[PDB]
Amino acid sequence: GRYIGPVCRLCRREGVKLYLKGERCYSPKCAMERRPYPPGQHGQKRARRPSDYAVRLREKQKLRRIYGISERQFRNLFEEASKKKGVTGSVFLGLLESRLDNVVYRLGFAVSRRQARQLVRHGHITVNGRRVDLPSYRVRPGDEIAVAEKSRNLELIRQNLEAMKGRKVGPWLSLDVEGMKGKFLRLPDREDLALPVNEQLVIEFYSR
Template sequence: MSKRIQAKHKIDRRLGVNLWGRPKSPVNDREYGPGQHGQRRKKPTDYGIQLMAKQRLKGYYGSIGERQFRKLYEEAARRRGDTSENLIGLLERRLETVVYRAKFVPTVFAARQFVNHGHVLVNGKRVNIGSYQLKEGDVVEVRDRAKQLAIVLGAAQSQERDVPEYVETDHKKMTARLVRVPQLGDVPYPVSMEPHLVVEYYSR
């Protein structure tokens, strides 16, 4: 698990956006960064803009470390097609991401923990690695012992966000299927993501 020490809300304030679109984000009240110098504004450089885009995308997925995120970029660059779209596809195919998208848990951080604790089956087999890459058609299921957990029931009933079209979900059976690998325009990010700037950052 990522060794993230700072509060999750601080990520929102440091980046200046409500990264997960949650009503309790402090950015809703204060759009400047934390600390006594948080309100200082200066025009960012091209490098700064690329770095912020990378931090925003990496931060959104919660528990991905820098080394792991760079490996995802390298894999995206190695594949045919548009590297930025490949990167989004790899991020959205992660098991913990699909668990979050299916609304089995309330946050991306809870998704990593939920998978790590062995509460999830993939095609009938237990998988406890959050970074596990799903394939189109793979079925993710919450194990019987976890289906009545308060966190699961609360997330499934939440009106805070919707399940995207590329994840087919049955909340009665607590199953989800990855219908297809999405493109950037399919992903319901609450804030603007610019993966092409992430590609520029790493390819400098």
Template sequence: MARPMGPRFKVARRLGVNVFNHPKALKRGAKKLGKQSDYGKQLMEKQKLKAYYGMLEKQFKLYVDQALSSKGNPGERLVQRLECRLDNIVYRLGFGSTLRQSRQIVVHGHILVNGKKVDIPSYKVEVGDIISLKEKSRKNEMHKENFYGQEMSLNYLEKDLESFSGKLVYIPNRDEIPIEVTDSYIIELYSK
């Protein structure tokens, strides 16, 4: 499985946004960018979105192509589709403290979707799907700490503390998704 393995904090400083949700990511400060061309702005937004969801170009392009061929606003569709990936939902529910850790939890087979083991990080979570931690994995202190320690502030997800599970209640609107990206720039870049 291909995934970005480079220095995370360097990427966050270059983009000027804490895309990895780590308290020390922008400790040394963001890079000051001079005047950017339209292409530069579009490229920067694409790089930000890829960094938020930990993706490489080839897979990201597939998501963009799906968004461009779907009905409705392609920028909004792209972000919604990325937000409904299994590794991201696992991260948002608090099974992992970072997206990388959540992806590893999925790949190692600790996650059940509707009672069946799913170890594919890009699995598309549908509305009503119940994501839970395997019975064996619930004994792990790290999983407990992450799950109970993280407050749930997203309306489109429902968290059940007793059964170590969560659920996608509805497909989120663009303004509910907690990322700082101008998605229209990304669509303009790929529409050329």
């Protein structure tokens, strides 16, 4: 499931700083501050001209490995897009962004998507009051993503809200900090995200 194992190891390999540990992959070592080259024996060895394939592949691995997601699951969303009305590339990003396990992250209740996931799986989170435990739950506009008033007193929930006390958030996300609740205003637009990834290549990888 998910991924399991070494994360700020793909921080590397992709060659762009991934935030997959949240707090540390963020602070004078996501190893991109130390060894910003791919892992293993042949790491700091001379690259070769990468192939038109290799390129499209990593970009997909990049986009997917960000959101922490199954290839099988990823690819369903992609196809689920495309046929859907409008520009495939964005929409996909939209749908990826509408995943609970990520909204919860985006909305500050957790420091990583990985940790954000666990909060969902352990019912610490609610959508419109009803307790939801599916990291895949597709959040539509107007939904309110609450903290379980039952879980409010956790050292993790406290500490991770006190950080966003001042912090500003997503031009499509509201956030009441003290009553520990937030809103899904609208699907983001490609430009709303500074995703270090070219979605057009990800379209291309699934075209050949």
